[PDB]
Design a binder for this molecule. Structure first.
Ligand SMILES: O[C@H]1[C@@H](O)[C@@H]([C@H]2CO2)O[C@@H](Oc2ccccc2)[C@@H]1O
Ligand SMILES: O[C@H]1[C@@H](O)[C@@H]([C@H]2CO2)O[C@@H](Oc2ccccc2)[C@@H]1O
Ligand SMILES: O[C@H]1[C@@H](O)[C@@H]([C@H]2CO2)O[C@@H](Oc2ccccc2)[C@@H]1O
Ligand SMILES: O[C@H]1[C@@H](O)[C@@H]([C@H]2CO2)O[C@@H](Oc2ccccc2)[C@@H]1O
Ligand SMILES: [Ca+2]
Ligand SMILES: [Ca+2]
Ligand SMILES: [Ca+2]
Ligand SMILES: [Ca+2]
Lengths: 121, 121, 121, 121
């Protein structure tokens, strides 16, 4: 299991200790407050009012929590995933990432606190 | 396990199929968008800027997800609870409720989608 | 979860800390060596060659591990149970018992080491 | 999770669907009756009275259930393993095998029924 912070200004993402393997079932719960620039902060689903101007993940709002498994494309996490199984052939370390436009992370602030565990399978 | 929706305008709350028993460990993940009145919506942590004017749960923000276990007082859920154990003396069906002031639910909108499961113990 | 020893000479059984509730899934693993009288010992499935002379559980061999859940009749445990759900309407404290004839426990010897856990549900 | 039978006369062992990965926690429960030649049968702990004449696993009795993880050496399973973690560096497919002397499996009979699952981690 893994517990840590995912900083909004971390463009590279936060590598976790979870290595997602075929057949694994995982649960993620994310909390906290972060911003992509403005003074306001949003929770792990991000800002539903802000248009997508080239986000790393088009399947979640600006300022949402997303992830990559190994070198997968970005997958939404938002507030978390409950007893979740990955698509076939997706495997590897989970990196958690704040959803913003590449090269625009420098004015971000805050972080999300995240727990990830493997479930029975 | 249980999965279902909790409407923001449902003052009485949504009953689940989860019966919390002594020693049980549970995980909850909540998602979605709701409002206590304004045209904006907030996630399951609610609106951190809005004063408490008599909320059903003083330990979470206005517009947060909270719960009762049996006849307990309100307990915060927010985006969820990871491998969580209830206080001593708490037992019974879990009811999920949007955090607002009694009698003021009629102008609320939206809902949260919630999963609850019992973990290993 | 519970871990402990179940003595072969204990007629009343070893009352565990596990309270089986409706919907619970449990796993039991039992090990060790015990006897109902003879100098030879057998594992948790008992002695397959010994006739049933009035055993507390007719559904397992003499010297097997069995249980009662609450006020239930005896249920075989043998080497254990994997992600097991009880029959409808069976619930309460799990008592583990060595399978022998009532009144004949005084010449028994040995014990089984048992783990019981609740699984996800 | 995996469920299947391990025949006592199967010198090559029974390959399972479980790929043990670093960090995984597993539970195994084994049941049934088998023999390494004699007319008696023994449970998954084997025959505690028969000396080791060159068994594939020197850490378990003759007629016990054992396993290999990947190309590891044999590891005892007996009646099962409860929320068990492998030694560092051991990984790969779990193969279950009856403990007997190489080249002497042809007179064996019976089998063990085994369940393996991954636990929370
Ligand atoms: O760093 C910038 C970068 O994160 C950009 C990407 C997310 O769309 O959004 C800007 O913020 C804006 C706020 C309101 C209107 C337009 C842009 C941020 O300042
Ligand atoms: O239904 C009302 C009730 O939910 C109230 C309680 C939660 O604090 O909030 C009002 O909304 C306001 C919005 C801005 C300023 C003041 C009140 C809502 O209109
Ligand atoms: O305490 C007695 C009681 O446990 C009995 C019940 C289980 O069948 O088995 C006897 O042992 C025997 C040994 C040899 C032949 C017959 C009985 C035991 O001596
Ligand atoms: O196939 C032979 C082989 O499985 C051997 C290995 C296990 O020690 O045991 C023999 O059975 C014996 C039984 C009693 C005494 C000696 C050998 C078996 O007949
Ligand atoms: Ca930014
Ligand atoms: Ca309202
Ligand atoms: Ca006896
Ligand atoms: Ca043999």
């Amino acid at each position: 299991a893994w517990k840590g912070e995912v900083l909004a200004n971390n463009e590279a993402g936060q590598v976790t200790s979870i290595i997602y393997n075929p057949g694994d079932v995982i649960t993620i719960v994310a909390a906290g407050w972060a911003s992509y620039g403005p003074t306001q902060k949003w929770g792990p689903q991000g800002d539903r009012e802000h248009p997508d101007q080239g986000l790393i993940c088009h399947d979640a709002f600006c300022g949402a929590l997303v992830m990559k498994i190994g070198n997968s494309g970005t997958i939404p996490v938002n507030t978390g995933l409950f007893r979740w199984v990955a698509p076939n052939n997706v495997q590897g370390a989970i990196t958690l990432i704040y959803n913003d436009v590449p090269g625009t992370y420098g004015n971000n602030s805050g972080s999300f606190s995240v727990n990830i565990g493997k479930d029975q399978s």
